[PDB]
């Protein structure tokens, strides 16, 4: 019933001979939303990443400073504010 | 058929039908709620040739080609030359008719 990987005999690490797990890590450049680059060590092999949604473009982190897209595309000739004002009578609710 | 064996094809077919068509059939009956006593019954010309044709068709359907017309023609030529399981079936029918000699009513 319980899904498992059944253990083999464990390998005896002798006292003193235990070595620390130094994983393989690359120096990875993260360019944030704006052009601020930051180096971070990372295990996945990718020298450069550029981020779209970060703290540097989120309103919470700087208060002082594709269905919708599809809709925009195929109702473009009409150009859809003035339109809101036209189609917003607040009597019926 | 004609191309394979150069002699009137219609006549040859008619001959084949005559050969193959079993002259009588052991028709089954209920027989007043008892043993189903079979009787030899004579056949109309059409019935005789109808029996023959179905067998001919069956034997043609065992031949190779895509076109049925070709298969049919090959079968007809074979029958003209003198080789079929249809003949064997006819013989068997005749043997079965021969058993039940006096089961015929009017005699």
């Amino acid at each position: 019933t319980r899904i498992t990987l059944p253990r083999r005999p464990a390998k005896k690490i002798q006292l003193g001979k235990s070595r620390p797990a130094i994983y393989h890590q690359f120096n990875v450049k993260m360019e944030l939303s704006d052009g601020s680059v930051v180096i971070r060590r990372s295990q996945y092999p990718k020298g450069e990443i550029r981020l779209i949604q970060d703290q540097r473009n989120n309103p919470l982190w700087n208060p002082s400073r594709g269905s919708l897209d599809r809709f925009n595309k195929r109702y473009s000739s009409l150009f859809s504010t003035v339109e809101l004002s036209e189609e917003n009578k607040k009597k019926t609710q | 058929v004609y191309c394979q064996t150069r002699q009137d094809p219609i006549q040859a077919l008619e001959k084949s039908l005559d050969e193959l068509a079993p002259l009588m059939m052991t028709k089954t009956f209920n027989t007043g709620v008892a043993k189903a006593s079979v009787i030899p019954v004579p056949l109309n010309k059409r019935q005789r040739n109808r029996i023959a044709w179905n067998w001919i068709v069956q034997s043609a359907n065992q031949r190779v080609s895509s076109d049925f017309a070709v298969r049919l023609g090959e079968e007809l030529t074979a029958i003209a030359k003198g080789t079929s399981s249809a003949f064997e079936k006819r013989d068997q029918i005749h043997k079965t008719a021969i058993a039940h000699r006096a089961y015929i009513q009017l005699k």
Binding site: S77, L78, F79, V82, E83, E86, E87 | -
Partner: protein, 115 residues
């Protein structure tokens, strides 16, 4: 209101009156009244050439038009009875009712289909 079912005082049709019939008739009258206007509004709406704001306004107006302005809302009732199934247009009658009339001789010519 109290004095009438619908907004506008329309006449009752002659002969067989029914609630459904009454409802239909009124609707038909309102359609007849406001046919040209509706057409004009539709035209204004479905126009690539005209200003978009105007077409939007026309569309809104069309949307806001009542139940009784709609052509699609009209349903051919039987006139003798008040049924709305198998209503033949050539004599505004229901199936059974038509047959009854036909056999009597009310539809002048209609007669048994003998071939």
């Amino acid at each position: 209101m109290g004095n009438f079912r619908f907004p506008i005082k329309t006449k009752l049709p002659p002969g067989f009156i029914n609630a459904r019939i009454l409802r239909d008739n009124f609707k038909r009258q309102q359609f007849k009244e406001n046919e040209i206007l509706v057409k004009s509004l539709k035209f204004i709406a479905r126009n690539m050439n005209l200003p978009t704001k105007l077409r939007l306004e026309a569309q809104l107006k069309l949307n806001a038009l009542p139940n009784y302005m709609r052509s699609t809302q009209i349903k051919n009732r039987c006139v003798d009875s008040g049924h709305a199934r198998f209503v033949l247009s050539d004599f505004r009658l229901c199936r059974y009712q038509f047959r009854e009339n036909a056999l009597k001789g009310n539809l002048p010519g209609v007669k048994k289909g003998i071939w």
